[PDB]
Write a protein that binds this DNA or RNA. Structure first.
Ligand SMILES: [Mg+2]
Ligand SMILES: [Mg+2]
Ligand SMILES: [Mg+2]
Ligand SMILES: [Mg+2]
Lengths: 160, 53, 128, 105, 84
RNA sequence: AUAGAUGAGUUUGGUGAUGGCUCUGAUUGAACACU
RNA sequence: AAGGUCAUGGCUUAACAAGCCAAUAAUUCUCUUAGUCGAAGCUGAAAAGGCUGAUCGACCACAUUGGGAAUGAAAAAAUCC
């Protein structure tokens, strides 16, 4: 549920605050959807499903993950590579917007307004560097990827 | 017209410059979400019975 | 304590799902629409964790404790009035889960009639 | 010409659990799902609703999972009808009287 | 309805009001019987309905008959194969 | 409707906070005083 | 089951059943205050903004206070008793 996305956001903040080169997440399709969007937006370096121990650092892309079955699904985890440029984490802040207590949904015209830096609904306008990820019927997208495809949906979190 | 234009965009192909520049994510991780039953679930259950006994 | 752990062996031997699968006529719940029965791996050991066994073990503890609180000087034991309330609320939750999970299976009725568990034990609110 | 036939229209299908049965003839209480939106908090709340459903042959038992359809008026408080049993409770489906199709009703 | 409509209603038709309550008393009586019959089946939230198997816990299935007393010694299920 | 988001005086030996009060803006089917 | 109805509904009736709604106040009662609403008026950068409920439009109620009926297509009267 949305609680896992909320844990994924606070965990990545703590892993970047600690300047960790790697970090693990519970293996769920929802966490994978947000991680693929962060990687697609350029905030993380890699995504790899593995066990409770991180794969070999050097051979990370050519890593061969074993098939996921009911005999090991309980130990699978998503390993994320974190970026740090100019003595600063590239994924500094991950502020959630929709929470377990309330799921915030935005319309296409509200996202068009938030994309240019104007408040709309419970959201606020985006500034230089900030990003916004929306969970739509076309997958987890960035607010500028959503307005291009002309869809709304559930707002997940704002990435500074 | 408003419907066709909106439906066309939601099902449009990604930009070429976005394809030839984005790093690779192995499909083994980006698309293998289904978790089937262990094919060896019966053999393991029969061996676990012997060891537990 | 010797009877406590001896009773635990009686509950696993009476309500143990590894025994009721063959003792009862229709232990498992009735199939749903479209669902068909498929074979599943055998159990590697006895059934000690099913809701029937746990509810039976809780019944033995509730009797051993409720029988001590009613004995001589039992009213003076104020701390264990929580323990009895905590055993009945643990059984209420398992009975409440097994009720909807088993959808009136013969394995659910065997537990009630044998342990004498009436609706008062899980239906409403247990106030002690 | 002078025959006023029923509408014979098909409405939506809701899945729910039978709450009570046997209290009244050819009638059971079924709990279905729902969600109402709070405009002040801007969130959804679980809004489950319990209706009286029409069981023509008395083939439903408490704790049973069934599919109901609205728009089938039978009484003052009964506007739903049983469509089919999803998951039976107690005994199998074949051991209960059959559920007539909407065409038969 | 409000209390004014209550007294006013029964004041218009005194006899008709009496008949309406005679029929209500029949169902209130029948409903009281079904409650007493359902409260009995309700049982106790701690003991429910003590069965011979629950009574066999006091001896760990080693006693063949329950203690007397009022009461009667009834047979209990045993587990003679169990040791200490 | 994409220009629209602002402060000030005042507690302390002093400093940073907390927290009210007052002023700064607009207005009235207004009243009163001087006109 | 029958009647009624364009049709539906104890809407009506007979015979049976004991149900139905509610359990966190459904229901009922006391006290205090108030005509209700609108980008109608004033106000904030803004919030399902706040305040008011003049002039304008819509709705409700009232015509000294209380208790009432008829007429009429319809009470919708500053009428009538
Ligand atoms: Mg003492
Ligand atoms: Mg919910
Ligand atoms: Mg000082
Ligand atoms: Mg007034």
């Amino acid at each position: 549920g949305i609680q896992q996305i909320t844990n994924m956001c606070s965990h990545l903040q703590n892993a970047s605050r600690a300047r960790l080169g790697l970090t693990s997440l519970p293996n769920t399709k929802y966490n994978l959807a947000l991680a693929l969007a962060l990687h697609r937006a350029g905030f993380i370096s890699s995504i790899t499903r593995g066990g409770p121990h991180p794969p070999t650092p050097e051979a990370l892309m050519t890593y061969e993950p074993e098939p996921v079955t009911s005999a090991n699904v309980a130990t699978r985890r998503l390993w994320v590579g974190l970026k740090y440029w100019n003595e600063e984490p590239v994924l500094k802040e991950l502020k959630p917007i929709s929470k377990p207590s309330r799921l915030v949904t935005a319309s296409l015209e509200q996202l068009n307004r938030v994309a240019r830096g104007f408040p709309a609904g419970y959201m606020k306008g985006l500034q230089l560097g900030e990003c916004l990820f929306v969970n739509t019927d076309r997958g987890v997208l960035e607010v500028r990827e959503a307005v291009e495809r002309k869809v709304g949906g559930l707002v997940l979190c704002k990435v500074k | 017209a408003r419907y066709l234009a909106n439906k066309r965009a939601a099902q449009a192909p990604e930009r070429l410059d976005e394809v030839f520049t984005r790093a690779t994510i192995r499909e083994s991780t980006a698309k293998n979400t289904f978790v089937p039953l262990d094919p060896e679930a019966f053999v393991k259950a029969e061996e676990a019975r012997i060891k537990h006994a | 304590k010797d009877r406590k752990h001896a009773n635990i062996r009686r509950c696993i031997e009476t309500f143990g799902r590894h025994i009721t699968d063959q003792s009862l006529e229709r232990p498992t719940p009735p199939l749903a629409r479209g669902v068909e029965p498929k074979p599943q791996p055998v159990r590697a050991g006895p059934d000690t964790g099913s809701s029937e066994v746990q509810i039976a073990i809780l019944t033995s503890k509730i009797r051993a404790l409720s029988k001590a609180l009613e004995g001589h000087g039992g009213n003076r034991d104020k701390n264990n009035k929580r323990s009895l309330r905590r055993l009945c609320h643990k059984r209420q939750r398992l009975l409440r889960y097994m009720e909807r999970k088993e959808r009136g299976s013969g394995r659910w009725h065997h537990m009630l009639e044998t342990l004498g568990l009436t609706p008062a034990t899980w239906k409403g609110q247990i106030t002690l | 010409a002078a025959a006023t036939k029923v509408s014979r229209k098909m409405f939506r299908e809701l899945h729910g659990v039978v709450v009570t049965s046997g209290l009244i003839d050819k009638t059971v209480k079924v709990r279905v799902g729902g969600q109402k939106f709070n405009k002040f908090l801007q969130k959804h709340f679980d809004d489950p609703k319990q209706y009286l459903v029409h069981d023509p042959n008395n083939s439903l038992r408490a704790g049973d999972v069934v599919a109901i359809m609205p728009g089938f008026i039978t009484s003052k408080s009964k506007r739903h009808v049983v469509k089919h049993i999803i998951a039976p409770a107690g005994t199998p489906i074949e051991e209960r009287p059959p559920i007539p199709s909407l065409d038969e009703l | 309805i409000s209390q004014k409509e209550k007294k006013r209603k029964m004041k218009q038709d005194p006899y008709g009001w009496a008949q309406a309550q005679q029929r209500k008393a029949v169902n209130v009586k029948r409903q009281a019987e079904l409650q007493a019959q359902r409260d009995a089946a309700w049982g106790d939230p701690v003991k429910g309905i003590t069965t011979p198997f629950v009574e066999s816990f006091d001896s760990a299935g080693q006693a063949s008959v329950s203690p007397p007393k009022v009461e009667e010694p009834k047979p209990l299920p045993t587990s003679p194969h169990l040791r200490n």
